[PDB]
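Forwarding the complex inputs:
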Amino acid sequence: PQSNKPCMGIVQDTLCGIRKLTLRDTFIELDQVLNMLYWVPDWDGVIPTPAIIKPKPLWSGKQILSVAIPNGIHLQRFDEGTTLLSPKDNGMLIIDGQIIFGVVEKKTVGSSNGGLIHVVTREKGPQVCAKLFGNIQKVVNFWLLHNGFSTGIGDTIADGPTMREITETIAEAKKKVLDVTKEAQANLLTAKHGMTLRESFEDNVVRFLNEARDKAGRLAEVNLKDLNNVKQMVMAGSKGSFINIAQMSACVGQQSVEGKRIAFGFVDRTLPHFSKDDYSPESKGFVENSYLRGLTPQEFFFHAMGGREGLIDTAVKTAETGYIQRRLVKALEDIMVHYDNT
Amino acid sequence: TLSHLRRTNTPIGRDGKLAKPRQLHNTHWGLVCPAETPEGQACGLVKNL
Amino acid sequence: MSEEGPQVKIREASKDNVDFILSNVDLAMANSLRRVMIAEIPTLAIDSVEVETNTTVLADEFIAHRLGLIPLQSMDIEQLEYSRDCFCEDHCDKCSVVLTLQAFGESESTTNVYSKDLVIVSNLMGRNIGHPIIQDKEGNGVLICKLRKGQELKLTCVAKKGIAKEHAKWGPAAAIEFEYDPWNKLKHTDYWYEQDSAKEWPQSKNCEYEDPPNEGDPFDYKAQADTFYMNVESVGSIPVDQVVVRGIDTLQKKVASILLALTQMDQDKVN
Amino acid sequence: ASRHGQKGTIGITYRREDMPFTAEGIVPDLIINPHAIPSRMTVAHLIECLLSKVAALSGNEGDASPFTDITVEGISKLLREHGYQSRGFEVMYNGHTGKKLMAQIFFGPTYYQRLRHMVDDKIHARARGPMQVLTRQPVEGRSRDGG
Amino acid sequence: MNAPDRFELFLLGEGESKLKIDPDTKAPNAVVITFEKEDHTLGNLIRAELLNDRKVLFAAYKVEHPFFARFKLRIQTTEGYDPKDALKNACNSIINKLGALKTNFETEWNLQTLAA
Amino acid sequence: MSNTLFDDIFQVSEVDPGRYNKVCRIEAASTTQDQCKLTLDINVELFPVAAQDSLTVTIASSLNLEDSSATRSWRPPQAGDRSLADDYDYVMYGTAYKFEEVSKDLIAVYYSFGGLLMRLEGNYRNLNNLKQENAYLLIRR
Amino acid sequence: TTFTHCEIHPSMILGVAASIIPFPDHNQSPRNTYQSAMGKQAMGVFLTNYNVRMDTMANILYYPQKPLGTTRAMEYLKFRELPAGQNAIVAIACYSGY
Amino acid sequence: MIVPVRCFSCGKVVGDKWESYLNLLQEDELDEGTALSRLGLKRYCCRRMILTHVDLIEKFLRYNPLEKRD
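Prediction (whole assembly, eight chains):
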């Protein structure tokens, strides 16, 4: 009742599996269908007629997974660019318990509004949804025990051409920053609206570097195939996002402290290895490497400060939030809905 | 034992809300370990050479 | 020759390793055979120790655990009895074996306590059992402990009969290799590639025993797994051919127990 | 715990028969979940696994010091000299039925440390027992069987 | 410590029946048979053999929790044919196959020893 | 009354593999009637199909060659049993979920064989009897 | 171009706790902090003469193994003389959901 | 701490081979990989057992359980 939406759902590896099961690619033979149908404790002893009767009987994952879903459940969801005959296998159509079309993933069996869990609870009851959790988990775990799944260092590697465009984008951003520096050093740069000249220079540099990192990350993400395990986990919705892929593969980016770049701790520099009055990005906390490539010492130091900030944040604001929470609950503890409805 | 015989304490109130003594500073390069620090109320206040 | 049954082709053999092909068989049967060969074949191992003198630098249960894994000859294990069935109190003469260990570090240089120094003092009744397994050139076998000047160890060991489903010490097989379908004709595994899957994955030694598929042939959607390539190595207690034969016998006895129980229940239903 | 901030607890134990195996009869001493890699970005865990595998297969100590010249591609080259798939994957069979597994599995040695917390030192229950002298409420302390 | 004894994996307790047969109330000619102190080694073999009988419709097994050694088998056959008879035929066929396998292996091993 | 509800001969233009590695989507035009087109998802690994091929497509309501299997459990095939499936070379079972009226003289029907989709576009009289809820699609190459 | 000194080696900007992580620069920094914390709760040979001492508590490991991947700095912390773990074969996978 | 008798992974026995393995390292002046393969250690788990062993028994042995200081 805090946000009127489900607080539980299919999570972690069952979620990673229920998606690999319902692709159009996945077909099941006879023996495994028999074992799977036995595993569902609410089975009624009827074997679904296959979808490919000849020249070999096969079952589609959607068909076996439809056994767990109760009867009388209807669901419609139209995603971007999906027609009544989905070519991308997007959206979801469930009619009287049968998956017509659509892959099932975090938007369907997760803790989201209007998903399968919410409609099942609002139509049948809490006990039926409680049964549904275990039915789905048993079926999908039994199948995933025989399919298999892993992850390795080969999923963070990108092909050479993608590396070439990555380096070229980084180079062009560096050139833009250098040109803005040259313009500002000749008193030609114009201060922005209600904002000092130094702030204008800093704003331009920060924006350029951030856009560079984002574009490189998107190139490296578009390169990846469909049989990549990290991409599969991200697509399913179970662990990670495109930021993680970008940092492990494309580039880490710009380390900050207190919302600004790495200030001058010494007098007119940031580290004894530089020269006085240096404003280049690599000297003010920019990491152009990746976790797969390796960090050089200075950007390692700047990354360490960036992490220290968040560590401190957690360690203290735990206590402050605790005090606020106690005061709030003590203030309101004696309020009750009466029989007058007041 | 090695880590214990190489420890320094900054005698400021460990509940004191001064953020600047906690954070890593540019002058710690090579004289203080940036990675190793406790967690909790002694974050940043306890240093290891 | 039995042409209606499973076929076998031994290619290699030795005291420890047997390397063969099993054809005209289901996959379930071969899997069950390997599971039984690893888990459910009895053997003889030390199951209790009592110590008199311990002036070493190690603990007592430390040396007990070291002793509990030493391999001993168990060829005629069919003539012993489970100690939970023998009517004797504690350990029998028909339901146990007994050894003694004594060592003393008289010399200045440290002295090693190997497993060649276990001496059997019970009565074997003419059975080939209880001998320690020795496989190194020097004959010393498993080294057990270490001694200095003025240190002594004295203890007595009781060895019994059991299986590997209750402790790893009774297992007679080290590791068994189980392969089939090296050309992926059946499409059972799906390969992971960067550029060309056919090159990144090396080739198994077994490819020479089948003919490569041709790109013009459509996917054969009627085949089943029929040929398996196995290799079995023994810890040393039992000969390896005996490991295979005893695995088959144990599987037979389990199925026969199922049959007997079913017949008994049918007779009960008759009543 | 491993040396990269990845710690956990034992949740179940299996015997060598139910363990998935490779074509060579090797069995994993332990199995971890891959849902722990992405959000933590512990690529050093994967690199340590790869390099330790290469060192075990080869027989020499493998350098892993920071800020050096070792790269991932170099150790992958040194790996393929021995006869394994370069990205550390391997073919593994199911332990129960003996079939092949559709997806390959990342496999190799690592270093683990046994931490100081055992479940035998945290388990506690109480139905009734001693009280306190002043407040007459159940005492504090697990070793003094308190509430 | 709460670790159960290992011998509970292969020794039946007193008052324990190795088989328990129960008619299934949903499909005609169907029985659920519980085996005790057994694991996949036997269930997989029996189900794979029961799948070869043309009069057997359904045959499936499961092991509900990996803590306990026991499993369930479910059989459904055609009209005028008893599932217990199907189980008996499967066991007989398995036993004959294993005997032939043992004889073949012994012949091959002796031939190798002659060639050794 | 014969079971076969619809019968025709089509010719395929192009195949659409997409991202999949087993399933393909094809579109085809009827060589007899000009206002009949077909879009179909098929399992190529069993029934490979190339461009510019002629295929006989039948929609039937039962495989028994002579006159309750909808609610009966599917039983494995027996030796000595003959049926309509013995003539063709690719048989699939599915259910229909949408009847669309494109115009006055054209209608489309959607079928879903276990997640494999098919759209059939044709004249009213040709697709008059396709109001069924479960159907067998048979294909002969 | 007017240099006055040089760094003897960058690795020395790290303490004694973090001189045991392998490839620390391929890691997010809080992970290095977390392992620097947890490196003080491993079980191992705290001294080679633990036999006599009557300490309030002591833990000892039966068989310790020196790691296969070692940093060069360990040769000064003597981590290949008194290790604190074992080399375990690990398979990263999904298997039965446990 | 004396060498483990058995391999933790494949059940094999490596305990007896430690003494002979130490011989090849200085009497024959061979490398570690060839010495490990000379004794039939072929799976890399057995190589792991032998290769990474810290032999602590030769330090306790110069010592007594009586009178350690601090």
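The CA atoms of residues 23 and 71 of chain G lie 8 Å apart.
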